[PDB]
Design a protein around this ligand. Structure first.
Ligand code: 5ID
Length: 327
């Protein structure tokens, strides 16, 4: 007997009541800008299927970022473009400024607004309680928006949250793994950074939803206020679930698996062992206590829950007392 099905408890049918044109990225015909508008200045980073460059738009002398896409599936390129276009102008969503294609080699590139990202080591030493609440609220705006627009980000992690702290500016980036939510759809569980993967991914439950992003966000919150980055530090996917179970406890994990009629690898049970649910206070120390409050812990507790259906939505999170001073 297979697992019990699931659907999102919010925004369940947002793509259902939109025109096919909205979510059908496969049929999306692309209109290309002019690649000779941009000059590459330096390489900023590289991933598996793209390289990212600082660039200048020579028509107005503004800095931009150019992401050149390695010859992967055209459907994945079209998906990311459609999602970026759908979300453009949303709060704290990185702005896709242009799309260009080398007219001879056919290589496509995406052009983004430039964000002057503050150095992590600098942020690590400077962010106050208030700063964290503010930026968390701004991330929530972005997630509530994309979720309300029927999109899961699926790669929420600190490296995909750019912060230009001197302008108090935040952008959620890297929409390369993002996907449209359709109720009943079985999704690839190989998404998100290991450290920010939800329990549903680690137990290979494919019928997940927007609530995956809320787990990832909870991990980020924990990392920031406890000053341990990443908070759950597994050495592989099996070990990642062990790190989670050592904090949330094994009892609720097995209740989760039981509720959804999920089957675990035999080896999984043996390495999961038996672990008490810990109190969040266990992670508060002299060095991080200025970032931790009762409302911070209550909020965190409402994000990091095994059952994806029991986690705060982005909207409910923004209503939490943790954000009173910010709002
Ligand atoms: N829009 C932007 N503005 C400035 N820098 C950007 C971006 C984007 I999208 C990515 N980066 C930087 O490139 C590297 C890989 O993401 C990382 O170092 C990342 O900081």
């Amino acid at each position: 007997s297979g697992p019990v099905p699931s659907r999102a408890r919010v925004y369940t049918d947002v793509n259902t009541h939109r025109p096919r044109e909205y979510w059908d990225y496969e049929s999306h015909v692309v209109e290309w800008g002019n690649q000779d508008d941009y000059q590459l200045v330096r390489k900023l980073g590289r991933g598996k299927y793209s390289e990212v460059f600082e660039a200048i738009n020579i028509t107005n002398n503004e800095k931009v970022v150019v992401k050149i896409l390695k010859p992967v599936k055209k459907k994945k390129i079209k998906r990311e473009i459609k999602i970026l276009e759908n979300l453009r102008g949303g709060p704290n969503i990185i702005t896709l400024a242009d799309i260009v294609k080398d007219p001879v080699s056919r290589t496509p590139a995406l052009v983004f607004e430039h964000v002057n990202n503050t150095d992590f080591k600098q942020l690590y030493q400077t962010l106050t309680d208030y700063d964290i609440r503010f930026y968390m609220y701004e991330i929530l705006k972005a997630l509530d928006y994309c979720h309300s627009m029927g999109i899961m980000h699926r790669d929420v992690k600190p490296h995909n949250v750019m912060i230009d702290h001197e302008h108090r500016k935040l952008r959620l980036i890297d929409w390369g793994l993002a996907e449209f939510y359709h109720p009943g759809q079985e999704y690839n569980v190989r998404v998100a950074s290991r450290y920010f993967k939800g329990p549903e991914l680690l137990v290979d439950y494919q019928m997940y939803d927007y609530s995956l992003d809320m787990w990832s966000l909870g991990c980020m919150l924990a990392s920031m206020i406890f000053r341990k980055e990443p908070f759950f530090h597994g050495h592989d996917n099996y070990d990642q679930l062990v790190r989670i179970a050592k904090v949330l406890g094994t009892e609720d994990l097995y209740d989760y698996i039981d509720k959804y009629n999920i089957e675990l690898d035999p080896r999984f049970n043996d390495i999961l062992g038996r672990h008490s649910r810990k109190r969040w206070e266990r992670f508060v120390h002299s060095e991080n206590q200025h970032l931790v409050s009762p409302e911070a812990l209550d909020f965190l507790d409402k994000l990091l829950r095994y059952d994806h259906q029991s986690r705060l939505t982005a909207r409910e999170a923004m209503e939490h007392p943790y954000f009173y001073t910010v709002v």
